[PDB]
Enzyme design. Structure first.
Site, short mmCIF file in Angstrom:
data_model
loop_
_atom_site.label_atom_id
_atom_site.label_comp_id
_atom_site.label_asym_id
_atom_site.label_seq_id
_atom_site.Cartn_x
_atom_site.Cartn_y
_atom_site.Cartn_z
NE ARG A 33 -3.08 -0.58 3.52
CZ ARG A 33 -3.64 -1.81 3.99
NH1 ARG A 33 -4.30 -2.48 3.16
NH2 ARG A 33 -3.35 -2.07 5.24
NE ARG A 87 -8.68 8.34 1.09
CZ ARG A 87 -9.60 8.11 -0.18
NH1 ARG A 87 -9.95 6.92 -0.74
NH2 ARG A 87 -10.12 9.36 -0.44
CG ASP A 138 -10.04 -3.52 -3.23
OD1 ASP A 138 -10.95 -2.42 -2.53
OD2 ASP A 138 -10.04 -4.75 -2.54
#
Lengths: 356, 356
Positions: free
Chosen positions: A27, A31, A76
């Protein structure tokens, strides 16, 4: 496709020796980037995603800020169960999941047939091909998917969990149905992953995030076999295809109990979390396999200077040969880009230093 | 207090040899009982609780249905941080927690002073004394509390979690403040636990449910020391008191990485989850210590007959000496009373069978 300039990552992967220790973060496209949110929710959480260009762009962003030794395709985990016909929603602004999870053996009828799955996930291949194209051989590109069991747990327990409920329960409750589903997930994942490599994926990561739920026994009757078939079959199909097979990595969160077998499920690489001790990990696995990990992502909350020795110790704990630096889990959304880079710099800094 | 007829549990605890294997379950007094809900929410989740009679009654109920070899006092882990001055709420019908968690080093001022804590938790002692009284020496009674770190994680992360956020972050972020808080939790727990034994508690369990979050290093700088001081000091104070010390159990969820040291934090017993392998556990710990556990509670979803061999294997895996059967985590609220008893029967059944 353009020729690979930097391949430290593939060589460490392959067990070959390297001048420094390659590094990347799970990741790393997440975000925690302002550039990331400016793009992610500048459409939809599950249909960009659908746009290769956007997937490419997410996959590229961290590489723009940090000299990561590899890139991992943005997508995802749920795209597989979704391709299989499960419907996802977009609930109050934290994460994705399934409002209509499988609950009885009956519900399995609602799933597509494994081989069709590949044709559903063609935007992913395109985003892969694209990205291989735009990295233009800067560093390698890793494709990925979630492992059968992990996928089962999302499909059965609706999504976002703690240490288990309904899924573990099917295992004891209706294992015939569990056998079946797990086969379906396996039969879908093989063509998906061949897929990514045809599309130009240079290494593949299988994620087993929900290993930890299971006992050693459960894990061996129910996760291990399938982790094994996927590797077996993906290698077979790739020969058949006349393609060079590619380093495969199995990452099992909380899989201390399973390192021994994982070392022989025929993956070149074993990914570890911070909960395993690096020396005890190497003991457990031997010298045929390369290890990956395993810094605690929360350590990035320390100072630039604190990080330095955590890396140093880790690097000393793991020791130069057969090793790829990484965080023991993916990054968190509130983390300071500076410290993500501090981590990278210190990996590169002190590994070449470790090698006098 | 009346004299103890059955003490298999204390003897297995002490390392002594026994004719069969003692058994009991964590949250054996829990929502999985219809009799339990008829009593629990027949007042309040945190002020019955306040009524010894009701706490007694909850502590007694499972013993009414199953020949458990011990009883554990009913209460909630949060009673300590609550005694310390943190306010709890009763939010939409699943679980308790803190709406106003500690968030900055400043917030520590709001906490009471460790020694006062004992006087706040006097209903607990009374419910203990009461229950020792009503068991009338049937089997022993275990007092309990959560361990410093675990308590810190509830106090800092508001309550109910997954694999960590703010708490682990304080550790890297502000460890001076972490040192301090952890001391306060320790200084409160020592008089609370002495308390339970004075009140007539015959064994004590310390719960470290949020061990798993931490690395081995984190665990040793931050959980281990305190797990150690509590044991040290509770034994000291009990001598001073002219009281017989009592078996102490440390249970660390996901603490595979810490069994080695836990074997020498001076607890008679080490509690394990299903994620550790029994043989590898005994290796890791040696022969001075008695082990506890470790059946997966989800196994109780299998048939009466399936359970039998899971117990059998477990019993064979652990082997007669130095051992107390238990579930690797507390029970779940939807579990069949029949199978809780099947588990017990099979422990008793096959342990005496194991001993030709």
């Amino acid at each position: 496709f353009p020729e690979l300039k930097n391949d430290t990552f593939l060589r460490a992967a392959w067990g070959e020796e390297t001048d420094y220790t390659p590094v990347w973060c799970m990741r790393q496209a997440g975000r925690y980037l302002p550039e990331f949110r400016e793009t992610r929710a500048a459409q939809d959480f599950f249909s960009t995603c659908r746009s290769p260009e956007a997937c490419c762009e997410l996959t590229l962003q961290p590489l723009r800020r940090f000299p990561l030794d590899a890139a991992i395709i943005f997508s995802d985990i749920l795209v597989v169960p979704q391709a299989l016909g499960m419907e996802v929603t977009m609930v109050p602004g934290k994460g994705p999941s399934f409002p209509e999870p499988l609950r009885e053996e009956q519900d399995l009828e609602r799933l597509r047939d494994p081989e069709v799955v590949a044709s559903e996930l063609g935007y992913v291949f395109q985003a892969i091909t694209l990205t291989r194209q735009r990295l233009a051989g800067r560093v390698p590109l890793i494709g990925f998917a979630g492992a059968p069991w992990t996928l089962m747990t999302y499909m059965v327990e609706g999504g976002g969990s703690s240490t288990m409920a309904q899924a573990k329960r099917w295992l004891y409750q209706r294992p015939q149905a569990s056998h079946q589903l797990l086969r379906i997930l396996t039969d879908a994942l093989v063509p998906y992953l061949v897929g990514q490599v045809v599309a130009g994926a240079q290494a593949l990561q299988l994620y087993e995030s929900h290993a930890g739920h299971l006992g050693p026994q459960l894990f061996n009757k129910f996760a291990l076999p399938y982790i094994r078939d996927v590797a077996k079959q993906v290698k077979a199909r790739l020969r058949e295809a006349g393609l060079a097979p590619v380093p495969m990595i199995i990452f099992a969160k909380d899989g201390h109990f399973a390192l021994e077998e994982l070392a022989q499920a025929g993956y070149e690489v074993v990914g570890l979390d911070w909960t395993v001790a690096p020396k005890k990990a190497r003991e457990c696995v031997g010298k045929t396999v390369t290890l990956q990990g395993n810094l605690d992502p929360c350590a990035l909350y320390a100072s630039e200077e604190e990080i330095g020795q955590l890396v140093k110790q880790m690097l000393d704990d793991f020791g130069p040969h057969r090793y790829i630096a990484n965080l023991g889990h993916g990054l968190y959304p509130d983390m300071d880009p500076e410290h993500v880079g501090a981590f990278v710099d210190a990996v590169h800094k002190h590994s070449r230093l470790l090698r006098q």
